[PDB]
Each structure stands twice: as C-alpha cells, then as structure tokens.
Ligand SMILES: *[C@@H]1O[C@H](CO[C@@H]2O[C@@H](C)[C@@H](O)[C@@H](O)[C@@H]2O)[C@@H](O[C@@H]2O[C@H](CO)[C@@H](O[C@@H]3O[C@H](CO[C@H]4O[C@H](CO)[C@@H](O)[C@H](O)[C@@H]4O)[C@@H](O)[C@H](O[C@H]4O[C@H](CO)[C@@H](O)[C@H](O)[C@@H]4O)[C@@H]3O)[C@H](O)[C@H]2NC(C)=O)[C@H](O)[C@H]1NC(C)=O
Ligand SMILES: *[C@@H]1O[C@H](CO)[C@@H](O[C@@H]2O[C@H](CO)[C@@H](O[C@@H]3O[C@H](CO)[C@@H](O)[C@H](O[C@H]4O[C@H](CO)[C@@H](O)[C@H](O)[C@@H]4O[C@H]4O[C@H](CO)[C@@H](O)[C@H](O)[C@@H]4O)[C@@H]3O)[C@H](O)[C@H]2NC(C)=O)[C@H](O)[C@H]1NC(C)=O
C-alpha cells in the first residue's frame with residue numbers, strides 16, 4: 001500500500017545569522033521507494049544538494065537524508081519539497097528557522 | 100550489542116525494467132553500498148573488508164554477484180508464470196544479517212517483504228511464509244525449499260559467514276565504532292521551550308529541562324534524526340506557562356563530555 005512521506009528540516013549546527021551551516025531534510029515513512037526531493041532557497045531549487053543512499057527501517061518504510069550547505073539570514077527562507085506517487089501535489093515543508 | 104543488517108531493495112517496474120540496490124549497516128554506521136549500476140560491492144569505510152583477504156572477499160562478492168542475477172531472473176520468471184494474476188509494479192525488500200552479543204553469541208535473521216509487507220523468512224533449514232502472507236507464495240516457497248544447495252548456502256551464510264565477518268568488522272573498525280563526538284545545544288521557542296541537541300555520537304544521550312536540581316517531568320523527547328556526518332540530532336520540548344520560563348535550563352549528559360554536562364539557561 002502506498003505510504004506518504006514525512007519531512008523534517010533541521011540544522012546541523014546552531015542556526016546563527018550570517019554563519020555557514022548545513023541544512024538537513026530527512027524524509028521518512030514512504031512507500032514505494034521512488035521519490036523526488038528538492039531543497040529550496042527563497043522558493044527556488046538549490047543546485048548542489050547531497051543525498052544519502054535510500055535505506056529502510058524495521059517497519060519496512062523507506063527513508064533518505066538530503067543536506068545542503070546554507071547560511072541563514074533574515075532575508076532568506078528554506079524549504080524541502082517532495083514529490084511522491086502517494087500525493088497528488090508536491091508537499092513542501094518550510095524550515096521553522098529554529099530547528 | 101551490534102546488529103549487522105544487509106538491506107536489499109529490488110524494484111520491478113515491468114517485464115523490461117528492474118533494479119536491485121543494497122546498503123549495509125553495522126549498528127548505525129554504513130559499511131557498504133551495492134548499486135544496481137555497479138558490478139562490485141562498494142566500501143564506505145577503510146575497514147569494510149573486515150579481516151578477509153582480497154581473495155576471500157572476491158569469493159564472497161562472487162557469490163552475491165551470482166545471487167543478484169539469479170534473484171532477478173527468479174522473480175521475473177515467477178511473475179511470468181503467475182501472469183496476469185500478479186501485476187507489476189513489484190517491490191521486494193530483504194533484511195538479512197545478525198545480531199552480535201557478549202561472549203561470542205549471535206542470532207541471525209533473513210526477512211523478506213513484498214509490496215511493503217513482511218511475507219517470508221528463512222528459519223532453521225527452510226524458507227517459510229509468515230502467517231497472513233498471500234497463499235500464492237506457498238508453491239514458489241515449496242519449490243525454493245527443494246533447492247538443497249541454496250538452502251545449505253543460506254544456512255552457511257546466516258549461521259557462519261555472518262558472525263565471522265562481523266567479528267572481523269568489529270576489530271578492523273574499532274576506532275570508528277567507539278568514536279565519541281560531542282553535542283552542541285541551543286534553545287528556542289503559554290508556550291513550548293525547545294532544547295536542540297546536535298552532533299553527538301554514539302546515540303545514547305540524556306536531555307532534560309531542569310529547574311535547578313529538579314527534572315521537569317513534562318519534558319518530551321523528540322525522535323532521533325540523523326545528521327549527515329554520522330552523528331545524531333534530538334530536541335526535547337517542555338510546555339510552560341507564560342511568564343514562568345525564568346529559572347529553567349536544558350541539561351545534556353553524554354558519554355563524550357565526561358561528567359561535564361552541558362547546561363543552557365533560558366533567558367540569558
Ligand atoms: C543453522 O542453524 C539453524 C538453527 O538456527 C535458527 O535458524 C537459522 C536460519 C538462524 O536464523 C538462527 O539464528 C536461528 O536460531 C539450524 O536449524 C535447525 O536444523 C535442524 C536440522 O539440521 C532441525 O532439527 C530438526 O528438527 C525437527 C524438529 O523441528 C521442529 O521442532 C523444533 C523444536 O523441537 C523446532 O525448533 C523447529 O522449529 C520445528 O518446529 C526434528 O523433527 C528433526 O528430527 C529429524 O531429523 C533428524 C536429523 O536432523 C533425525 O536425527 C531425527 O531423529 C528426525 O528424523 C530435526 O531434529 C532444527 O529444527 C532447526 N532449527 C529450527 C529452528 O528450525 C541449522 O541446521 C543450522 N545449519 C547449519 C549448516 O549450521
Ligand atoms: C540493473 O542492472 C542490471 C544488470 O546489469 C541491468 O540489466 C542489464 O541491463 C543491460 C542494459 O540494458 C542489458 O543489456 C541490454 O540487453 C538488450 C536486450 O537484452 C540488448 O539488446 C541491449 O543492447 C542495446 O543497448 C545497448 C546499450 O545499453 C547498446 O550498446 C546496443 O547497441 C543496443 O542498443 C540498441 O538497442 C537498443 C534497445 O535496448 C536501442 O534503443 C539502441 O538505440 C540500439 O538500437 C543491451 O545490451 C543486460 O542484458 C542486463 N543484464 C542482465 C539482465 O544481466 C539493469 O537494467 C539495471 N537496471 C536499471 C534500471 O538500470
């Protein structure tokens with residue numbers, strides 16, 4: 001049966017404005033494994049995003065971790081957008097600027 | 100305890116397209132990947148070959164090489180024979196490996212899921228369907244059990260090759276497996292104070308909101324989320340009556356810190 005992806009977005013180091021950092025988008029609990037993940041800066045696709053190999057958990061659902069260098073500032077927003085067969089439209093989750 | 104898990108994910112889109120990819124973990128550290136696109140199994144650590152010689156690794160890899168092609172043909176032939184009762188697409192996953200414990204004791208496992216659901220395991224000397232699995236699997240599993248050679252190979256792989264190989268991985272990877280990485284923490288927010296803790300390894304950790312010496316009971320631990328550099332991230336949140344955040348602190352205890360806990364005071 002299809003399972004819908006869950007998306008969490010969080011920072012590797014304390015987010016401090018102007019300070020280079022790493023933003024993660026962890027995508028979990030989905031099936032089937034085919035999925036398209038983009039990270040967004042001001043609503044536009046960030047080009048160099050790196051992805052972990054897909055893997056799966058004890059319950060058999062898949063997960064993957066995306067990450068990108070970023071420098072937060074108070075003029076930029078960040079998000080993670082996912083397309084999967086389980087959803088009619090892509091799902092976007094914005095970074096809450098704190099995680 | 101360390102659990103070594105070989106995770107295979109095979110997708111059959113139709114009669115002309117399939118792919119099989121694998122990843123291998125020892126505990127929470129990845130040790131191999133094996134892309135469909137690749138003839139050979141890739142190393143993700145300098146110690147991924149464990150204590151096996153190049154010759155012995157080649158032999159083990161050869162067996163998997165034969166298995167990967169054999170498995171793909173077996174599934175495609177099964178779908179042909181069942182046609183059109185079993186439609187493409189088909190997703191098969193396999194989780195196989197062993198759990199290593201004190202002394203030199205270990206338990207092995209080999210579980211298979213079909214369309215996301217556990218359906219078959221190897222146990223003892225045979226493949227079996229699990230109760231609840233679709234009845235059309237009974238016949239192909241009976242036929243696979245008549246393959247004595249495959250049964251003997253799997254019993255060797257589970258009962259012998261696995262724990263032996265992993266003993267070698269534990270010795271060769273000792274300094275990575277026993278690594279200590281220190282957490283850093285930060286705070287954010289009638290409301291919810293959040294203590295974020297990131298960068299620690301290994302996974303066990305204690306994070307609690309405190310008022311002085313007293314643990315705040317209402318502290319809720321989040322999920323452990325992985326960072327991309329083999330460390331962990333966790334938040335713990337506490338709902339607090341507005342105006343009464345003064346005097347609160349987040350405390351973090353972790354093996355990497357010694358007994359020097361991190362204490363982060365709110366509002367300060
Ligand atoms: C590898 O280890 C296997 C056991 O380990 C488990 O499975 C593997 C895959 C790993 O996942 C591991 O971590 C697991 O814990 C071991 O399997 C054992 O194989 C022997 C035969 O070689 C089986 O013995 C036969 O047992 C049946 C009775 O079985 C039923 O009852 C018992 C409890 O009483 C249950 O445990 C079983 O689940 C069954 O419900 C006997 O009827 C049969 O006796 C007949 O045959 C013998 C000759 O073997 C004659 O001497 C007798 O007189 C009878 O004719 C056997 O005794 C054993 O069931 C099986 N364990 C399990 C759980 O199935 C495997 O052999 C190892 N292989 C190698 C190469 O090391
Ligand atoms: C996962 O890995 C497995 C195992 O490696 C992959 O399965 C193998 O896939 C290869 C590549 O497709 C396949 O080789 C093909 O077999 C075809 C029929 O069996 C051949 O006819 C075909 O040759 C054509 O493509 C070649 C380039 O790939 C050309 O060099 C050759 O000239 C042929 O090109 C003509 O025909 C094509 C149509 O295929 C046409 O469009 C071209 O224009 C030209 O007319 C390939 O040799 C292996 O047999 C498979 N190996 C097995 C089964 O063991 C598998 O595909 C991977 N999965 C994914 C999704 O990537």
Ligand SMILES: CCCCCCCCCCCCCC[C@@H](O)[C@@H](O)[C@H](CO[C@H]1O[C@H](CO)[C@H](O)[C@H](O)[C@H]1O)NC(=O)CCCCCCC
Pocket residue numbers: 162165166169170173174177191193195209211213219243246247248249252253
């Ligand atoms: C939609 C169905 C759901 C699928 C659930 C079924 C579970 C699938 C498990 C099938 C796994 C074995 C597939 C290959 C096997 O059938 C056989 O073709 C090959 C080839 O067999 C032939 O060669 C061997 C030696 O190479 C023996 O001589 C054997 O007797 C012979 O038939 N055997 C091996 O590669 C043995 C090692 C298997 C490891 C499996 C790990 C999961």
Ligand SMILES: CCCCCCCCCCCCCCCC(=O)O
Pocket residue numbers: 105106107121123131133140163167195196256257260261264
């Ligand atoms: C496939 C599980 C076998 C259990 C233990 C075997 C001992 C070492 C295996 C190491 C690398 C395995 C590579 C993945 C194979 C696959 O899933 O197709």
Ligand SMILES: *[C@@H]1O[C@H](CO)[C@@H](O)[C@H](O)[C@H]1NC(C)=O
Pocket residue numbers: 112113114115116
């Ligand atoms: C089977 O599915 C693949 C992957 O979705 C698709 O691209 C293609 O149409 C199919 N392959 C063939 C040879 O028809």
